Design an enzyme around this catalytic site. Structure first.
Site, PDB file in Angstrom:
ATOM      1  N   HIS B  40     -11.457 108.910  70.057  1.00  0.00           N
ATOM      2  CA  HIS B  40     -10.950 107.560  69.978  1.00  0.00           C
ATOM      3  C   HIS B  40     -11.944 106.509  70.470  1.00  0.00           C
ATOM      4  O   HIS B  40     -11.706 105.320  70.310  1.00  0.00           O
ATOM      5  CB  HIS B  40      -9.601 107.440  70.689  1.00  0.00           C
ATOM      6  CG  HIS B  40      -9.685 107.386  72.178  1.00  0.00           C
ATOM      7  ND1 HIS B  40      -9.386 108.479  72.964  1.00  0.00           N
ATOM      8  CD2 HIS B  40      -9.797 106.332  73.024  1.00  0.00           C
ATOM      9  CE1 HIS B  40      -9.300 108.098  74.226  1.00  0.00           C
ATOM     10  NE2 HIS B  40      -9.543 106.800  74.288  1.00  0.00           N
ATOM     11  N   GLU B  52     -27.480 105.736  84.307  1.00  0.00           N
ATOM     12  CA  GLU B  52     -26.948 104.543  84.952  1.00  0.00           C
ATOM     13  C   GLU B  52     -26.098 104.957  86.142  1.00  0.00           C
ATOM     14  O   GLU B  52     -25.372 105.938  86.069  1.00  0.00           O
ATOM     15  CB  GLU B  52     -26.071 103.743  83.992  1.00  0.00           C
ATOM     16  CG  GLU B  52     -26.789 103.072  82.836  1.00  0.00           C
ATOM     17  CD  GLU B  52     -25.799 102.575  81.777  1.00  0.00           C
ATOM     18  OE1 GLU B  52     -24.893 103.350  81.409  1.00  0.00           O
ATOM     19  OE2 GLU B  52     -25.905 101.421  81.312  1.00  0.00           O
ATOM     20  N   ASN B  54     -25.276 102.016  88.879  1.00  0.00           N
ATOM     21  CA  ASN B  54     -24.699 100.690  88.908  1.00  0.00           C
ATOM     22  C   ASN B  54     -24.819 100.205  87.480  1.00  0.00           C
ATOM     23  O   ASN B  54     -25.898 100.225  86.903  1.00  0.00           O
ATOM     24  CB  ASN B  54     -25.501  99.808  89.864  1.00  0.00           C
ATOM     25  CG  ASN B  54     -24.869  98.468  90.066  1.00  0.00           C
ATOM     26  OD1 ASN B  54     -24.438  97.823  89.118  1.00  0.00           O
ATOM     27  ND2 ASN B  54     -24.906  97.989  91.284  1.00  0.00           N
ATOM     28  N   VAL B  57     -26.654  96.567  87.351  1.00  0.00           N
ATOM     29  CA  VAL B  57     -28.017  96.386  87.841  1.00  0.00           C
ATOM     30  C   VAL B  57     -28.846  97.620  87.534  1.00  0.00           C
ATOM     31  O   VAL B  57     -28.499  98.717  87.949  1.00  0.00           O
ATOM     32  CB  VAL B  57     -28.031  96.134  89.377  1.00  0.00           C
ATOM     33  CG1 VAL B  57     -29.451  95.907  89.873  1.00  0.00           C
ATOM     34  CG2 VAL B  57     -27.161  94.942  89.713  1.00  0.00           C
ATOM     35  N   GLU B  62     -32.680 104.379  83.796  1.00  0.00           N
ATOM     36  CA  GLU B  62     -31.864 104.301  82.602  1.00  0.00           C
ATOM     37  C   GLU B  62     -32.698 104.617  81.360  1.00  0.00           C
ATOM     38  O   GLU B  62     -33.894 104.303  81.298  1.00  0.00           O
ATOM     39  CB  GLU B  62     -31.264 102.901  82.471  1.00  0.00           C
ATOM     40  CG  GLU B  62     -30.296 102.509  83.573  1.00  0.00           C
ATOM     41  CD  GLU B  62     -30.963 101.970  84.839  1.00  0.00           C
ATOM     42  OE1 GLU B  62     -32.202 101.876  84.925  1.00  0.00           O
ATOM     43  OE2 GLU B  62     -30.217 101.608  85.759  1.00  0.00           O
ATOM     44  N   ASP B  84      -9.010 114.980  70.296  1.00  0.00           N
ATOM     45  CA  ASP B  84      -9.694 113.761  70.729  1.00  0.00           C
ATOM     46  C   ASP B  84     -11.075 114.120  71.280  1.00  0.00           C
ATOM     47  O   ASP B  84     -11.265 114.201  72.501  1.00  0.00           O
ATOM     48  CB  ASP B  84      -8.869 113.075  71.824  1.00  0.00           C
ATOM     49  CG  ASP B  84      -9.362 111.663  72.157  1.00  0.00           C
ATOM     50  OD1 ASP B  84     -10.194 111.114  71.405  1.00  0.00           O
ATOM     51  OD2 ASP B  84      -8.864 111.080  73.152  1.00  0.00           O
ATOM     52  N   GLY B 175     -11.275 102.577  80.238  1.00  0.00           N
ATOM     53  CA  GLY B 175     -12.732 102.485  80.295  1.00  0.00           C
ATOM     54  C   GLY B 175     -13.375 103.806  80.699  1.00  0.00           C
ATOM     55  O   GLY B 175     -14.603 103.953  80.685  1.00  0.00           O
ATOM     56  N   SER B 177     -12.326 106.611  79.301  1.00  0.00           N
ATOM     57  CA  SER B 177     -12.165 107.465  78.138  1.00  0.00           C
ATOM     58  C   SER B 177     -13.484 108.034  77.693  1.00  0.00           C
ATOM     59  O   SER B 177     -14.500 107.341  77.733  1.00  0.00           O
ATOM     60  CB  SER B 177     -11.538 106.687  76.985  1.00  0.00           C
ATOM     61  OG  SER B 177     -10.165 106.448  77.279  1.00  0.00           O
ATOM     62  N   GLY B 178     -13.455 109.314  77.337  1.00  0.00           N
ATOM     63  CA  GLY B 178     -14.628 109.996  76.836  1.00  0.00           C
ATOM     64  C   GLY B 178     -15.429 110.668  77.930  1.00  0.00           C
ATOM     65  O   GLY B 178     -16.237 111.545  77.665  1.00  0.00           O
TER      66      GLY B 178
END
Lengths: 224, 224
Positions: B40, B52, B54, B57, B62, B84, B175, B177-178
């Protein structure tokens, strides 16, 4: 039993619990007056209970019978758990019905790959206490001696075998000792020991009942 | 993640965030070139960010890599969120170091009782909105399917399981999710859905990654 399921109604009529107030081990009814369990479940005074499903709530078919005789295998080794097998004579004959009946002894040793049913009221969680009310069941296959020796280097004797999954996840656990491993209508194993519960490459180890088939009959005959 | 804590440094090197302009979802790096997330979380264009901590920042580790292919499970059910799960092939291979590493897929399904670590940059407020800068972690236990199926009677498929606390207080949220649910160093779950965050007796539901292990390797092999 970790990773198991609730045993169906009267699918395990031969399952018994050994108790000193409460259940500390399982066992298997192999004669109207005899139960096989693990030798390390030994105690001086044992009350055997038959016909339990929910070990907390009476459902009506329970039989409470105190052990008359407790005979642990003479060559039982405490340290190695070698010859981890014990016979209990019931002080009276169990009443055989659809909820309480016997399981046959094995005519041949366990055959690798064979699907078996393990059952008990042991811990159902790999970590932490989580004891079940209802008898738990697990279908697990016989593993090769090779895989068994490999998993437990130098611990495995010919009086032991391994049933389970090398990936872990499903297994016997604390409280399941003495209980039955039944394959194709025959008691092939008694829950003996393991390295943790349901750990990867640490399947449970079971007493090879097949090696004791003569000792059991002889012992029952001598104590009848 | 409600009721959690700032993950330590270097503890979640496999955590990725999916962005199609914004951080909408989390995900896991399972191969130098592949991420699992929730079906989804599908967008046609996704940039994956690895390394990542933070999310606001930059701290220096990253890696920004655009999705080359985005493969949702072909039986993904938008209605039930059954199946899903989604695979993303990165357009370049991630540089694996101390802060961006992969996580192993599960060799056995969730055994109840096992502690897991859910993580994400999702809403930390049950009521309202409080999105964290630092990645949030949450230790939660695998709930019995019995308890899972109960809390969402008729919603729970064999492809789903529950991790968390029936009391409430601690749970994944919007947020997240996944994102990964890792138990014993294996990705057991993908944050999928729930009813309310930290919601009393309505615990978090997760995609059972175990059922997809073959599909995953085949899809990766078929797209390499």
């Amino acid at each position: 039993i970790v990773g198991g399921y609730n045993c169906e109604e009267n699918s395990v009529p031969y399952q018994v619990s050994l108790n000193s107030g409460y259940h500390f081990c399982g066992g298997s009814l192999i004669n109207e007056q005899w139960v096989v369990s693990a030798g390390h479940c030994y105690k001086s005074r044992i009350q055997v209970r038959l016909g339990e499903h929910n070990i907390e709530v009476l459902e009506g078919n329970e039989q409470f019978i105190n052990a008359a005789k407790i005979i642990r295998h003479p060559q039982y080794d405490r340290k190695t758990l070698n010859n981890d097998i014990m016979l209990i004579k019931l002080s009276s004959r169990a009443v055989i019905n659809a909820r309480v009946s016997t399981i046959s002894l094995p005519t041949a040793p366990p055959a690798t790959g064979t699907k078996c049913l393990i059952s008990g009221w042991g811990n159902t969680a790999s970590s932490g206490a989580d004891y079940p009310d209802e008898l738990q069941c697990l279908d697990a296959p016989v593993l090769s001696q090779a895989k068994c020796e490999a998993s437990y280097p130098g611990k495995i004797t010919s009086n032991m075998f391994c049933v389970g999954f090398l990936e872990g996840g499903k297994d016997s656990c604390q409280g399941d000792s003495g209980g039955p491993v039944v394959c194709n209508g025959q008691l092939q194993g008694v829950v003996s020991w393991g390295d943790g519960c349901a750990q990867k490459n640490k399947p449970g180890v079971y007493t090879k009942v097949y090696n004791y088939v003569k000792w059991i009959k002889n012992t029952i005959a001598a104590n009848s």
